[PDB]
């Protein structure tokens, strides 16, 4: 069920969706975040064809309210430059194609220093 990611303080992390796409389909990808201690972080869209242009459809202000950088979002991938407790929790990726697909993957990001 969960893709578990163990992270260290002030290390970066990357969540990589096991992404597979069909040429010429329009896709929208969303990332949602359920903090440990719901919120759509971001939504992007593009026609699938590095050289892939995309449009940023929506973005959340959650991390900005905390004076922290929101994750960077690219097709298939979520990046956090510096780990801190407010980035820990559950991330859900959902990508929807104009061919009718909806794909989900869920990540659990936890702090390495808390064993068991």
């Amino acid at each position, epitope marked *: 069920r969960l893709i578990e990611v163990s992270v260290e*303080e*002030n*290390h*970066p992390f990357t969540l990589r969706a096991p992404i597979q796409r069909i040429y010429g389909v329009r896709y929208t990808e969303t990332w949602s975040f359920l903090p440990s201690l719901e919120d759509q972080l971001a939504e992007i869209s593009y026609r699938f064809q590095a050289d892939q242009p995309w449009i940023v459809v929506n973005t959340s202000t959650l991390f900005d309210e905390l*004076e922290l*950088d929101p994750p*960077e979002i690219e097709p298939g991938v979520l*990046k956090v*430059l*510096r780990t801190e407790k407010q980035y820990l929790g559950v991330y859900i990726w959902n990508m929807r194609g104009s061919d009718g697909t909806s794909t989900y993957a869920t990540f659990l990001v936890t702090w390495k220093g808390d064993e068991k």
Partner: antibody
């Protein structure tokens, strides 16, 4: 100790892609103890972080470069490189490669630096 | 982005003086603050990390303090070789540098 050497063109035409290579000696690129970064310096805009790469190849970028920068690593030759696309005169600068350390109580810092390479964007 | 500011822009001091340079972060950055020394025609060189940890091989006359938004670099017994531009840099959000403080030597 670890040493870094940049190499690349001095002159690049506007709209072309700046390409630079940093070669690492006295160490290797194989541990999440270190990240490998590009930084630049221009009289006007001071020092600017461009981005860095981990040993596994994960990249993280300054959003200010508008995803025009690509950092890649070739751990075999203990090298890493920078590609900056669609260059303008505003990209004229001294480009430096450096090693990055981090810790739970300090976060990132740049502990060893290459000597810098001046890249002039001009028609 | 976090705006790092420094004071003074430049100073002139005599050999043997004690000089302090100030660095301010636009928001709290804990102690994620580094100091770099840049001599003419050289790359910046790390002096202090974590606001107060002296890098190995850096002379003990360099000292850093601060946490939060205000940081200080003190050079306790200024030397001719300390002619340089000194820069602060934050590692709490997208990495940013201050604009540098130029230290000139009076003789």
């Amino acid at each position: 100790q670890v040493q870094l050497q940049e190499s690349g063109p001095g002159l690049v035409k506007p709209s072309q892609t700046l390409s630079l290579t940093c070669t690492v000696s006295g160490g290797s690129i194989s541990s999440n103890d270190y990240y490998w970064t590009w930084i630049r310096q221009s009289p006007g805009k001071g020092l600017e972080w461009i981005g860095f790469i981990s040993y596994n190849g994960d990249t993280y970028y300054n959003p200010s470069l508008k995803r025009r920068g690509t950092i890649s690593v070739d751990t075999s030759k203990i090298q890493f490189s920078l590609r900056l696309s669609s260059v303008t005169a505003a990209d004229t600068a001294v480009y430096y490669c450096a090693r990055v350390r981090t810790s739970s109580t300090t976060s990132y810092y740049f502990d060893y630096w290459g000597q810098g390479t001046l890249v002039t964007v001009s028609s | 982005d976090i705006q790092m500011t420094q004071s003074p822009s430049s100073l002139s001091a005599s050999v043997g003086d004690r000089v302090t340079i100030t660095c301010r972060a636009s928001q709290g950055i804990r102690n994620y603050l580094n100091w770099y020394q840049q001599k003419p025609g050289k790359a910046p060189m790390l002096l202090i990390y974590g606001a107060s940890s002296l890098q190995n091989g850096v002379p003990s006359r360099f000292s850093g303090s601060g946490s939060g938004t205000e940081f200080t670099l003190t050079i306790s017994s200024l030397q001719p070789e300390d002619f340089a531009t000194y820069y602060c840099q934050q590692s709490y959000r997208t990495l940013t540098f201050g604009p540098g403080t130029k230290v000139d030597i009076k003789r």
